[PDB]
Amino acid sequence: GAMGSMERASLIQKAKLAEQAERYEDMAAFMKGAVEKGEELSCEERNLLSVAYKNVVGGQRAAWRVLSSIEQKSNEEGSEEKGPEVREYREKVETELQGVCDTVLGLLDSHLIKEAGDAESRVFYLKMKGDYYRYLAEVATGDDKKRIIDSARSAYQEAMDISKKEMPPTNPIRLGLALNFSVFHYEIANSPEEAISLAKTTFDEAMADLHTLSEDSYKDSTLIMQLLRDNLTLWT
Amino acid sequence: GAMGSMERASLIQKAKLAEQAERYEDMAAFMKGAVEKGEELSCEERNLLSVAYKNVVGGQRAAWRVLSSIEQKSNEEGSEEKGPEVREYREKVETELQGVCDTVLGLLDSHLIKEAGDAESRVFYLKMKGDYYRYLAEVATGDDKKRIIDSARSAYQEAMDISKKEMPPTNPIRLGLALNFSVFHYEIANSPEEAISLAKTTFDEAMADLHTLSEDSYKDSTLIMQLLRDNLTLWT
Amino acid sequence: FPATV
Amino acid sequence: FPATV
Ligand SMILES: CC(C)(Oc1ccc(Cl)cc1)C(=O)N1CCC(CNC(=O)CCl)CC1
Ligand SMILES: CC(C)(Oc1ccc(Cl)cc1)C(=O)N1CCC(CNC(=O)CCl)CC1
Ligand SMILES: [Mg+2]
Ligand SMILES: [Mg+2]
Ligand SMILES: [Mg+2]
Ligand SMILES: [Mg+2]
Ligand SMILES: [Mg+2]
Ligand SMILES: [Mg+2]
């Protein structure tokens, strides 16, 4: 690893600098280096890792969607043949996207998840596992598409089961997990009713627990609750 | 070159796709490949090249400024020592930025400028040469800073001389050249009076020639004239 | 697209 | 920062 010679603390410092500079590829590389030191990640560090890769893959997904749309339009009736270039370049972006997902999944498997015993860490990593399998699913079209979808589902389900047992219904990781699993149901699993039920039940159980929270915890939980409401509004 | 096996037309097609996908590093790599085919670039192709590298270096410059500001704050009195990491990471970004500038300057020198005989092409490339020396100047601090500044000045001056002889005062390349050379004077050469005089004279000579233009040419010229006015407003 | 975090 | 194109 190119980061093998850099101190763990220096990698974390530089990840924070990269975030300030909106250098998310660098941020991700620094955090991958930090993970590969072999120590568990603190809460702050877990969130640096997630922010970095979310921004990298988010850019790739956006680009993929642009290219896939152009490609789909090229394959309509009346469309003039433009050669293999659109497919080639969509494939290039797709392959890069898959590479990033595989990298993140690799970090989780070697060895973040197995060392994560606290609910906060284990749920966080399992949510990530579901998310990155979901991104793989978005672009999957072959023999393995069903298995990729099932891998996402399984990771999210394990995270949900732990979160329900071990976390209050307003915990932001629990809320974000539910938000994303609901989107998985709607967009990937062709289960819009499940998506809607999950979002509604999550919102309502959070609402009922807000009274227990400080002002600052209230802010965090209500932000994610609003995202649940936004999706429900989109879907109904 | 990794693009050596791809057709020139395919590289240009893919540069356009990359632009639509906001994949400017890819766009730049495709256009570098196209240049390295050895043929002259059309007007559209020159502008693909410039858009690509402008966006790449623009991101690097923005990141550099964030990091340089953090670094400068670390070196004030009362600032707690945080070690070498801020300098290291600013240097990393700086080195990458310089690499991109050197790449562009290399394309111009091998062999875009020497093959450019029409005023439109030669002025366009000389403006680019000035711009990328200006970006090098922004980060320069050593034995060569004066020579880098002079290289920018020389390229801009040759472009100005050709543009004044060969192009109308409303030509968008002539206007953009003047805009940027004016910024060079203000920000790099410590010559704010020269910057202001250039911007004003350019604006006024353009104003006087607008009557000759179609609606569409008028739109292009007035857009850049407004940038000249914006700078003048900033500076006075 | 729907919201995720 | 000032405008350039
Ligand atoms: C967006 C918002 C409000 O919530 C979430 C929720 C879930 C995820 Cl995966 C990401 C963001 C947010 O940025 N923050 C800041 C980071 C916080 C991290 N907290 C934990 O790890 C333990 Cl509670 C969550 C809220
Ligand atoms: C911003 C605006 C209006 O002008 C400029 C002016 C100068 C430069 Cl270097 C870049 C943009 C613009 O995008 N366009 C579109 C591209 C056009 C290219 N024209 C030429 O090569 C020959 Cl006239 C200029 C105007
Ligand atoms: Mg150590
Ligand atoms: Mg593929
Ligand atoms: Mg249920
Ligand atoms: Mg050929
Ligand atoms: Mg340096
Ligand atoms: Mg003069």
Numbering used by the authors:
A (entry chain A), B (entry chain A): -4 to 231
C (entry chain B), D (entry chain B): 591 to 595
Give the text the authors published on this PDB structure:
14-3-3 binds at the extreme C-terminus of ERα via recognition of its penultimate threonine phosphorylation (Thr594), thereby suppressing the transcriptional activity of ERα and concomitant breast cancer cell proliferation.
It is noteworthy that although the tethering hit was crystallized using a soaking method, for the electrophilic analogues, cocrystallization was more successful in obtaining high-resolution structures, which confirmed covalent binding to Cys38. For both compounds, despite the conformational switch, a halogen bond was formed between p-Cl and Lys122 at 3.5 Å, similar to the halogen bond observed in the original fragment. For further SAR optimization, the 1C-chloroacetamide warhead was selected since it showed consistency in the MS and FA assays, a similar conformation as the disulfide hit, and a clear cooperative effect for PPI stabilization.
